[PDB]
């Protein structure tokens, strides 16, 4: 169901600093299989969409360990500590329900201070 | 692994359409080709999905029958192959390394293309 949480927007943010984001809406999001299944992704101005996984994110290459999380329930998390100048990118978390439905996170990206 | 697609198609509405995407330097009949769609001024939305070995096809319920796809084994190649166009599909479209099917991992989608800018 439905656009799922942004959670944050996007606020002008300066350099080195901290942020997180919040994979959240009313479905269940965890089969009885027992992980999580939330999909995280994120990309740059450019294009290629980027590898941040179904666990609540979670990744397996070598795009930056400044991004990681976790989580349980409905409601789950992915951090941001030390907000690189480069990282001017939108982040995503993604739906499951097979070859129903057709959602993805609300447009979170980076602005700068 | 890699993979490459068509440049941009800009021209007047109507008329039948196609653009290819071609995987290589990986197992191209062995991971489905996923989707993704984004017009200008807005965020992600989801097409559909096609398996290269044998064509199983599970389009998305916002676009199914207002889009046709395909895929080729021996050429490592897969295309949007629509029967017409609309002034709705003006986008930059996108394919991928798709999602299920890896002993595990719903995700997957790890290996990716450049892009391609359909418009009317
Ligand atoms: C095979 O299936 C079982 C049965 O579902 C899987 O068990 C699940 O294992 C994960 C840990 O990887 C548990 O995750 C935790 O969930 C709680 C909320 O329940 C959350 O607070 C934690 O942060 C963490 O995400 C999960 O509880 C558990 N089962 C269920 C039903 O949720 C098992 O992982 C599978 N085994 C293999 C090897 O794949």
């Known amino acids: 169901d439905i656009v799922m949480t942004q959670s944050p927007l996007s606020l002008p943010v300066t350099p080195g600093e901290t942020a997180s984001i919040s994979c959240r809406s009313s479905?269940?999001?965890?089969?009885?299989?027992?992980?999580?299944?939330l999909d995280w992704y994120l990309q740059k101005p450019g294009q290629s969409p980027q590898l941040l996984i179904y666990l609540g994110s979670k990744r397996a290459s070598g795009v930056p360990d400044r991004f990681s999380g976790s989580g349980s329930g409905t409601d789950f998390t992915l951090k941001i500590s030390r907000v690189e100048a480069e990282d001017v990118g939108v982040y995503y978390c993604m739906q499951t329900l097979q070859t129903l439905m057709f959602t993805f996170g609300g447009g979170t990206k980076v602005e700068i201070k | 692994v890699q993979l490459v697609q068509s440049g941009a198609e800009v021209k007047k509405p109507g008329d039948s359409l196609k653009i290819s995407c071609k995987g290589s330097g990986y197992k191209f009949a062995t991971y489905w080709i996923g989707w993704v769609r984004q017009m200008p001024g807005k965020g992600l939305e989801w097409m559909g999905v096609?398996?290269?070995?044998?064509?199983?096809?599970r389009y998305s319920p916002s676009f199914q029958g207002q889009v046709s796809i395909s895929v080729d084994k021996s050429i490592t190649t897969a295309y949007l192959q629509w029967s017409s166009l609309k002034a709705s599909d003006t986008a930059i479209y996108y394919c991928?390394?798709?999602?299920?099917?890896?002993?595990?991992?719903?995700?997957?989608?790890?290996?990716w293309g450049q892009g391609t800018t359909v418009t009317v």
């Open positions: 096609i398996y290269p070995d044998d064509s199983d096809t």
């Open positions: 991928a390394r798709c999602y299920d099917f890896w002993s595990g991992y719903q995700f997957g989608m790890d290996v």
């Open positions: 479905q269940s999001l965890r089969h009885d299989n027992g992980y999580n299944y």
